[PDB]
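Structure, all two chains, one model.
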Amino acid sequence: IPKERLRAQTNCILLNVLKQGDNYVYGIIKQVKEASNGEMELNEATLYTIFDRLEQDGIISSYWGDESQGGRRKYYRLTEIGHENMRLDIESWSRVDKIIENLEANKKSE
Amino acid sequence: IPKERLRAQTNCILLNVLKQGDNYVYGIIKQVKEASNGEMELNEATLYTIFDRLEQDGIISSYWGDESQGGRRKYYRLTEIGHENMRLDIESWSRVDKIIENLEANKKSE
């Protein structure tokens, strides 16, 4: 319950980083540290566990980057399904919020 | 994934009904039908499955109502833990949204 809340919120934050453009682990981790004012310092193990599921479910794809450094670097991209699922999320959840303000309003009536 | 999104959103809507005051199945189902403009017509089986978990985890409590009708009627109440968990949710998720607008802003910088 305290770990389940986080799981969703981490996943949400990570996918929004990939919304800003394709990225690789440390690029993501440093961006998250920055935008969360140091609160959320992500682990590589955590990020890869989450990314390994997301890739399986077709929400993100991985590809090899430019190797003009003399080394491998895995980039991550938000797929088509993942863009769509991200849109439906905002659609569903704003609808929910309309349904809730209607229940707070049906109180005022009754 | 399409069923997991709903599970969370149903749970959220149901707990907000119990925010408006203690209630019993059909009172809840009719209120949800109303505030969702007929879209969400809940099943008793569904509602009770969800409520049986929520009660186990201590988020809601059940009690017997007034029996001046000559019949049993189970009411449901949002517990202390459940009020707190509902507050933390809004706390965490608005923070998340700050973290996201910061990632959409760190783009504009870079």
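The first strand of chain A starts at residue 60 and ends at 64.
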